[PDB]
Amino acid sequence: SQIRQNYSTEVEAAVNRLVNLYLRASYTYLSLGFYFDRDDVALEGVCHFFRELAEEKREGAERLLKMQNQRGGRALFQDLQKPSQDEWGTTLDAMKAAIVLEKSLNQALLDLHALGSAQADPHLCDFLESHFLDEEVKLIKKMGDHLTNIQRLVGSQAGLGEYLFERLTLKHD
Amino acid sequence: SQIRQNYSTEVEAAVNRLVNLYLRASYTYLSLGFYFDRDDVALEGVCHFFRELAEEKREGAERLLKMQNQRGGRALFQDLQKPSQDEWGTTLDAMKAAIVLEKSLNQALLDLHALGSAQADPHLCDFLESHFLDEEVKLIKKMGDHLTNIQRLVGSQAGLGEYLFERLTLKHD
Amino acid sequence: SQIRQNYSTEVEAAVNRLVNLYLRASYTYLSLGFYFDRDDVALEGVCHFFRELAEEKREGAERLLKMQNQRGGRALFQDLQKPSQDEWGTTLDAMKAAIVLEKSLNQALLDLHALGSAQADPHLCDFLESHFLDEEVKLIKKMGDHLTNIQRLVGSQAGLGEYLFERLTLKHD
Amino acid sequence: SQIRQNYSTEVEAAVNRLVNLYLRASYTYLSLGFYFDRDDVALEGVCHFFRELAEEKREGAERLLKMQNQRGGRALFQDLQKPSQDEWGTTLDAMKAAIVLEKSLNQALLDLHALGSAQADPHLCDFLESHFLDEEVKLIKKMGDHLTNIQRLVGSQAGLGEYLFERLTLKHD
Ligand SMILES: [Pd+2]
Ligand SMILES: [Pd+2]
Ligand SMILES: [Pd+2]
Ligand SMILES: [Pd+2]
Ligand SMILES: [Pd+2]
Ligand SMILES: [Pd+2]
Ligand SMILES: [Pd+2]
Ligand SMILES: [Pd+2]
Ligand SMILES: [Pd+2]
Ligand SMILES: [Pd+2]
Ligand SMILES: [Pd+2]
Ligand SMILES: [Pd+2]
Ligand SMILES: [Pd+2]
Ligand SMILES: [Pd+2]
Ligand SMILES: [Pd+2]
Ligand SMILES: [Pd+2]
Ligand SMILES: [Pd+2]
Ligand SMILES: [Pd+2]
Ligand SMILES: [Pd+2]
Ligand SMILES: [Pd+2]
Ligand SMILES: [Pd+2]
Ligand SMILES: [Pd+2]
Ligand SMILES: [Pd+2]
Ligand SMILES: [Pd+2]
Ligand SMILES: [Pd+2]
Ligand SMILES: [Pd+2]
Ligand SMILES: [Pd+2]
Ligand SMILES: [Pd+2]
Ligand SMILES: [Pd+2]
Ligand SMILES: [Pd+2]
Ligand SMILES: [Pd+2]
Ligand SMILES: [Pd+2]
Ligand SMILES: [Pd+2]
Ligand SMILES: [Pd+2]
Ligand SMILES: [Pd+2]
Ligand SMILES: [Pd+2]
Numbered sequence: 001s002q003i004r005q006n007y008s009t010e011v012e013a014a015v016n017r018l019v020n021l022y023l024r025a026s027y028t029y030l031s032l033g034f035y036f037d038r039d040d041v042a043l044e045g046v047c048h049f050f051r052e053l054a055e056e057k058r059e060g061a062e063r064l065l066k067m068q069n070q071r072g073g074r075a076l077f078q079d080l081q082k083p084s085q086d087e088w089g090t091t092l093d094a095m096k097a098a099i100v101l102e103k104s105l106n107q108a109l110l111d112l113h114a115l116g117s118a119q120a121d122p123h124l125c126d127f128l129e130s131h132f133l134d135e136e137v138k139l140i141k142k143m144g145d146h147l148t149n150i151q152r153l154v155g156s157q158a159g160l161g162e163y164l165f166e167r168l169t170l171k172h173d
Numbered sequence: 174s175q176i177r178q179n180y181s182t183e184v185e186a187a188v189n190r191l192v193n194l195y196l197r198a199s200y201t202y203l204s205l206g207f208y209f210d211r212d213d214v215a216l217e218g219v220c221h222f223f224r225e226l227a228e229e230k231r232e233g234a235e236r237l238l239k240m241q242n243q244r245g246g247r248a249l250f251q252d253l254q255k256p257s258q259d260e261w262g263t264t265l266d267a268m269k270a271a272i273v274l275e276k277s278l279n280q281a282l283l284d285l286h287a288l289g290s291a292q293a294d295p296h297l298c299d300f301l302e303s304h305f306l307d308e309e310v311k312l313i314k315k316m317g318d319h320l321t322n323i324q325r326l327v328g329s330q331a332g333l334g335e336y337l338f339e340r341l342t343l344k345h346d
Numbered sequence: 347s348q349i350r351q352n353y354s355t356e357v358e359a360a361v362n363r364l365v366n367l368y369l370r371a372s373y374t375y376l377s378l379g380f381y382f383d384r385d386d387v388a389l390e391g392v393c394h395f396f397r398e399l400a401e402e403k404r405e406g407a408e409r410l411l412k413m414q415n416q417r418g419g420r421a422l423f424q425d426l427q428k429p430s431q432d433e434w435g436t437t438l439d440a441m442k443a444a445i446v447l448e449k450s451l452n453q454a455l456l457d458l459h460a461l462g463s464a465q466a467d468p469h470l471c472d473f474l475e476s477h478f479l480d481e482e483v484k485l486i487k488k489m490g491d492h493l494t495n496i497q498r499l500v501g502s503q504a505g506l507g508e509y510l511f512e513r514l515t516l517k518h519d
Numbered sequence: 520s521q522i523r524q525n526y527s528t529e530v531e532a533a534v535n536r537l538v539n540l541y542l543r544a545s546y547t548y549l550s551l552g553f554y555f556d557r558d559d560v561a562l563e564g565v566c567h568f569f570r571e572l573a574e575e576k577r578e579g580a581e582r583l584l585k586m587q588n589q590r591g592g593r594a595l596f597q598d599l600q601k602p603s604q605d606e607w608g609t610t611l612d613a614m615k616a617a618i619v620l621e622k623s624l625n626q627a628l629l630d631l632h633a634l635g636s637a638q639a640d641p642h643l644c645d646f647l648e649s650h651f652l653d654e655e656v657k658l659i660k661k662m663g664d665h666l667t668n669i670q671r672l673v674g675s676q677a678g679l680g681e682y683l684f685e686r687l688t689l690k691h692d
Contacts, residue, residue: 126302472648
């Protein structure tokens with residue numbers, strides 16, 4: 001209790017929930033990544049795109065935890081539920097699932113920001129702005145762009161389009 | 174009056190008060206620093222920790238003054254009261270006094286931010302966020318950590334614990 | 347099914363279970379790390395030791411998943427249960443909990459190796475040997491050493507001993 | 520006979536057979552490589568992929584021979600039969616033939632390892648593990664991945680898919 005100042009029990013609880021959501025997202029991306037690495041799926045560009053996102057979500061959770069400790073709150077961890085699917089279908093299906101996931105994280109961030117604004121907590125506000133809200137927007141725009149390109153490349157020749165997208169948009173170094 | 178825009182007389186007065194509080198804090202840290210440099214106290218790690226904080230508070234006051242001029246307000250200086258003590262007791266006593274001081278500065282920042290939000294002044298809001306609120310949080314967490322370690326090192330052997338903290342946590346380059 | 351060769355359904359299931367155990371361990375270390383970063387605990391050496399172990403357990407899970415895909419098995423993820431404690435007591439308590447955890451992972455590795463030897467699967471054997479069994483042994487020896495030193499430093503002056511261990515054994519760069 | 524120790528006549532014979540199988544494989548890859556270099560086939564990415572595999576199989580045979588001499592066994596060479604085909608069809612046909620070949624080599628390695636484990640010959644075991652079993656697994660996963668991508672790229676437009684795979688997956692420096 002020695003440092004805690006202007007940090008409500010409600011914000012503290014909502015930051016712990018958000019941490020669980022970011023770790024859940026990280027776990028979802030780990031599964032997406034290993035799915036595309038299956039010898040019967042074998043799209044390497046799609047597998048590391050999803051593995052970079054896993055790392056990013058884990059880092060987001062870690063930033064939230066550091067902040068919680070900086071404000072004198074107490075981290076409380078809960079079970080992490082498994083990803084929503086065991087098999088993720090096509091690149092199109094996966095990118096759709098990813099956007100749905102990012103939008104749910106975005107909405108949780110907005111819900112937390114609204115809470116902090118109602119709680120008169122400008123530090124929370126500035127933290128969430130500078131570290132999460134803009135990265136989320138940029139990420140969702142990128143996924144939106146990917147999805148449009150995937151979608152354009154379907155019809156008639158789906159195997160061909162899925163290969164070319166991975167080779168020409170996704171793949172790497 | 175040629176540039177001043179959306180900058181109330183109330184915010185202007187509160188920024189001048191905050192400048193006085195930061196200079197008061199800087200002066201308090203100058204005294205803490207020279208106290209630990211006394212030949213009958215002689216803890217050099219504690220003396221420069223407090224001298225870096227003096228510089229930081231002075232710079233915070235200077236940032237506020239620059240902003241006041243940028244917005245077309247007018248700096249007005251008042252007498253600076255002397256620090257609350259002439260002798261600061263133990264490292265434990267001093268770190269406690271320092272935390273009390275930072276928390277009072279933090280609360281003044283929150284009070285100013287609330288004022289600026291009530292005044293519809295988003296520039297003030299962004300200024301205080303990006304430059305003061307987060308640094309204050311980080312500083313108070315660091316002092317909290319120090320205090321916990323000091324506290325742990327007492328009982329039975331206080332001289333020994335105060336020496337070891339200065340040597341092993343504080344001291345320097 | 348195009349590549350899978352000499353890889354039983356039993357080994358595949360046991361590798362998925364082991365992956366869950368390594369991720370659980372990683373999560374346990376994340377919680378231990380943030381616990382020691384609390385302003386009312388404030389032992390930084392203990393916090394990053396535990397954060398390096400979190401990364402190591404995550405990497406172990408990832409190595410297992412890559413192997414599973416190399417052999418044509420299918421990764422299946424389950425819920426990750428939360429760590430066994432919300433508060434981890436002293437450095438001594440924490441190091442004890444860590445050793446218990448590593449020994450349970452070690453035993454799971456031995457159980458999997460025995461399975462693979464009973465299944466006539468020399469690739470599994472060589473994989474587990476070269477990548478997990480020796481690292482586990484080395485890690486447990488290191489934790490054992492830490493625990494002995496912690497234990498030596500208690501009696502009479504526990505706060506002092508816990509500070510000195512963190513400063514002189516643990517802490518860092 | 521001056522050095523030979525714990526090395527059975529049965530293992531020695533099986534190592535000579537395995538050497539013949541690796542040289543046969545190397546010869547098969549030499550033929551696959553020159554087939555794709557025909558002016559009426561002309562897929563350069565597919566031709567050097569197969570030429571790197573020829574070199575790798577030759578090196579595997581050479582490693583086995585060196586080991587045989589290290590253990591005091593005697594290399595005995597037999598006729599090398601010609602590859603199973605004179606013309607290898609499409610890239611798809613060829614990659615399928617390659618996987619069949621690697622899996623037969625893998626099975627021969629497992630059969631030799633089982634022999635050495637039944638013969639109480641831990642050196643053989645460690646040799647085969649560290650030098651052959653893992654490389655074989657990794658190679659077969661890579662071929663599996665290739666085959667999946669080839670397969671995806673067929674239907675309707677086979678010429679186009681075979682060109683794009685060679686250009687975008689296979690080809691080189
Ligand atoms: Pd506290
Ligand atoms: Pd991958
Ligand atoms: Pd990648
Ligand atoms: Pd990847
Ligand atoms: Pd990658
Ligand atoms: Pd990348
Ligand atoms: Pd706000
Ligand atoms: Pd905000
Ligand atoms: Pd704000
Ligand atoms: Pd003016
Ligand atoms: Pd000094
Ligand atoms: Pd100093
Ligand atoms: Pd000094
Ligand atoms: Pd100094
Ligand atoms: Pd310094
Ligand atoms: Pd505002
Ligand atoms: Pd603000
Ligand atoms: Pd604002
Ligand atoms: Pd398969
Ligand atoms: Pd830390
Ligand atoms: Pd550390
Ligand atoms: Pd740390
Ligand atoms: Pd660290
Ligand atoms: Pd380290
Ligand atoms: Pd074995
Ligand atoms: Pd083994
Ligand atoms: Pd073995
Ligand atoms: Pd001999
Ligand atoms: Pd060629
Ligand atoms: Pd080539
Ligand atoms: Pd070639
Ligand atoms: Pd070439
Ligand atoms: Pd090459
Ligand atoms: Pd063996
Ligand atoms: Pd072996
Ligand atoms: Pd062995």
